[PDB]
């Protein structure tokens, strides 16, 4: 058993509009994901609690405040434009700079980094409370709990210092790592979600107080497409403290646990005082976003390998979109973590 | 009587997919636009000619060759991806940098700057030859003609050094300004299209040999959105040689002609040896994209004021999407333009 944090306002976010790979697409990051995960927590006896409100400052500790202002007001500003612009803020102008940042359209152009981060009426509210779950889990562990589960939804690891992306708005995991830093000198973030966490990579790129390690599918024509390659090793004093571990599309379960063995070598050498685990079930064989053949039992083995580290660990929910397997995969993972 | 250049391969580009302001939208930059302007040209006794092939060098004089190779190959590399991706290359990852440029998706992220520049089977060809029409008109002027009309389509002025955008792939006006620099020490580019020519601006931003002056709608919540504000005046030696003349949304025709007046004052102070006119008919008051109340006879007033400069002038077609008034608006423009010439 460990504390699991989830706020019901997290279910309110449900936008309809996603642009990807030439066409508009069906939403995959839906409220039902959190319903299945809560069911799994219940079946394992975990207490599921509402996080306290830690306020904006710990979010601002990671994200640029002009981005957070944008995020908070964009739906209201988008609603004041013609009915014809629709109900969800999205960017159709793909320019960070040069950029005057005058008007909501120019602001979307800077602060929404792909066609997968629509901002609806309840998006900021849901995103805010998903970050608070991360913070609550981080607080619990900071104060002495060996582990807690942040049941984050919307997910976070694609959110950059000043831009949303890939169904993410606020980088829950990075926010949790920065909270742990108040007490621990060395924090590691390990991300095993199917996709590279380009947001987490960017936030800590020039730093060595937080290690980042990611196992993910080869980003050649695969989200996030422009980062995640193995020659991205950090900058300045962060050089040597960012490790990308990509896998060929169509990899075996074995190849994934090879990458987990690389990750465990990097962690041993860094010797972290605390761990944030960005966990995704989209490595599952039947997840439609999957590029590796991880089985339900595989999640149990991953859970065991990380739990045996006996580090203070905040587990932060990221992706995984195959609704009917979420409960089984979560239960296998947490069963291995606790054995 | 003015030489008009048009190549029929320009008519081949007809993409189906545009994404802007929250949704997929109907194509506005369609082949029929060329057909109406060619018929306008004829009806005024303009000789219409196909441009000779000036080759890739003058295009690559302005554009990055990574971007040019990408334009030429992207449709084929995109057809290699799953049929679910569709037939037209478009970006859904809005990141130019950092960008490792591995795979066609990352190449698109870098080289397609908005949801209005889809690349279909014949986009490269049409864009290539649209540029050749610009080069043919500039050549004719370079060699002694007093004016020439490049019937460009697709348009060009939103095309940056390294990226397509806004229905534009190759920056025709810029390509003509640079060619004219072969014979002329100072060239000016005047842009009266409804939208800010952010590509032309970028190309010449640190140069004082090519002035850029653009009249357009206030870019606050209006394409190109991120550029075209009046404090953008150039860099280095080109400080003072970039002039943006925005107008409030829903401006009167009187307001438009006040801005034309400001613009002519800048041209006089600069004293160009030759002029490139990026002309758009989307200031027309019933054009869907319009934010100013310009009438049909207003195009005549515009042509008259610009023709009275009596400068060697390459007229370069940019936008204008109201099909049923295109012929009447162009005829009025050209009829005003010749008035005080010769
Ligand atoms: K990952
Ligand atoms: K303009
Ligand atoms: Zn993922
Ligand atoms: Zn225009």
From Swiss-Prot, chain A:
Q: What EC number(s) would the UniProt record show? A: 3.5.1.-, 3.5.1.62
Protein name (Swiss-Prot/TrEMBL): Acetylpolyamine amidohydrolase
Q: Which organism is it from?
A: Burkholderia pseudomallei (strain 1710b)
Subunit structure, interactors included: Homodimer.
Q: Which family does it belong to?
A: Belongs to the histone deacetylase family.
Task: Write the signal peptide boundaries.
Answer: none
Which InterPro entries does the record associate with it?
HDAC_PDAC, His_deacetylse, His_deacetylse_dom, His_deacetylse_dom_sf, Ureohydrolase_dom_sf
Which cofactor is recorded for it? Zn(2+)
Locate the site labelled Polarizes the scissile carbonyl of the substrate: 321
Keywords of the record: Hydrolase, Metal-binding, Zinc
Q: Which top EC class applies here?
A: hydrolase
Catalyses: N-acetylputrescine + H2O = putrescine + acetate; N-acetylcadaverine + H2O = cadaverine + acetate
Q: What is a single Pfam family found in this protein's UniProt entry?
A: Hist_deacetyl
- Pathway of action: Amine and polyamine metabolism
Question: Which CDD domains does the protein's record reference?
Answer: HDAC_classII_APAH
Tell me which residues bind Zn(2+).
193, 195, 282
């Amino acid at each position: 058993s460990m504390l699991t944090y989830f706020h019901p306002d997290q279910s309110l976010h449900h936008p309809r509009t996603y642009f990807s790979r030439g066409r508009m697409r069906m939403p995959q990051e839906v409220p039902e994901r959190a319903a299945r995960l809560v069911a799994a927590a219940f079946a394992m006896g975990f207490p599921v609690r509402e996080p306290d409100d830690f306020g904006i400052a710990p979010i601002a500790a990671v994200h640029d405040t002009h981005y957070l202002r944008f995020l908070e007001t964009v739906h209201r500003e988008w609603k004041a434009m013609p009915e014809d612009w629709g109900d969800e803020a999205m960017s159709n102008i793909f320019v960070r700079e040069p950029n005057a940042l005058r008007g909501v359209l120019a602001q979307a152009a800077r602060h929404l980094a792909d066609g997968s981060c629509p901002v609806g009426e309840h998006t900021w509210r849901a995103a805010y409370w998903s970050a608070q779950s991360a913070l609550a889990a981080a607080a619990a562990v900071r104060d002495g709990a060996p582990a807690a589960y942040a049941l984050c939804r919307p997910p976070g690891h694609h959110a950059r210092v000043d831009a949303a992306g890939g169904f993410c708005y606020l980088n829950n995991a990075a926010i949790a790592a920065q909270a742990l830093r108040a007490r621990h000198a060395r924090v590691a973030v390990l991300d095993t979600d199917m996709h590279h966490g380009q947001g987490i990579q960017e936030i800590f790129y020039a730093r060595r107080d937080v290690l980042y390690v990611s196992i993910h599918g080869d980003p050649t024509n695969f989200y996030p497409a422009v980062a995640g390659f193995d020659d991205e090793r950090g900058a300045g004093e962060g050089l040597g403290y960012n490790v990308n571990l990509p896998m060929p599309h169509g990899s075996s379960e074995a190849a994934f646990f090879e990458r987990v063995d690389d990750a465990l070598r990097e962690l041993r050498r860094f010797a972290p005082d605390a761990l944030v685990l960005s966990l995704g079930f989209d490595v599952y064989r039947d997840d439609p976003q999957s590029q590796v053949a991880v089985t339900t039992d595989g999640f149990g083995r991953l859970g065991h390998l990380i739990g045996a580290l006996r580090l203070p660990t905040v587990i932060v929910q990221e992706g995984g979109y195959h609704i009917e397997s979420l409960e089984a995969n979560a239960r296998s993972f947490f069963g291995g973590f606790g054995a």
